[PDB]
């Protein structure tokens, strides 16, 4: 099942995200809506 915003430690560090902080693209996902390709 798709888990929005659940990412690996490698990707967290690549995105500059510290612990207990939202990935930057999640702020966009919450306004754009659920990814259409994952709709079920």
């Amino acid at each position: 099942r798709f888990k929005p915003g659940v990412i690996s430690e490698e990707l967290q560090d690549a995105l500059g995200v510290t612990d207990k902080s939202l990935p930057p693209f999640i702020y966009r996902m919450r306004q754009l809506g659920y990814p259409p390709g994952w709709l079920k």
């Binding site: 990412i7 990707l11 690549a14 995105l15 500059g16 930057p24 754009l32 990814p35």
Partner: protein, 80 residues
């Protein structure tokens, strides 16, 4: 076809196909990511992302264009 693919440029040298696969997997199921090589075998600084669904392509543009990987904003372009 090209309907389901994106061009991703301005990649920091440490960006890999694996990393881009995971990131764009957030926009929709990804089939494959390809960072091409030159004749000498050196990876380029851009990638092609192949999605399972065309609908993921405009969404990924809005979700991810300009997001920083290792401090550099990725530059997404449509291929179709």
């Amino acid at each position: 076809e090209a309907d389901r693919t994106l061009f991703v440029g301005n990649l920091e040298t440490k960006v890999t196909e694996e990393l881009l696969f995971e990131l764009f997997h957030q926009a929709g199921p990804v089939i494959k990511v390809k960072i091409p090589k030159d004749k000498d075998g050196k990876p380029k600084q851009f990638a092609f992302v192949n999605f399972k669904h065309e609908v993921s392509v405009p969404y990924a543009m809005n979700l991810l264009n300009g997001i920083k990987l290792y401090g550099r904003p990725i530059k997404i372009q449509f291929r179709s």
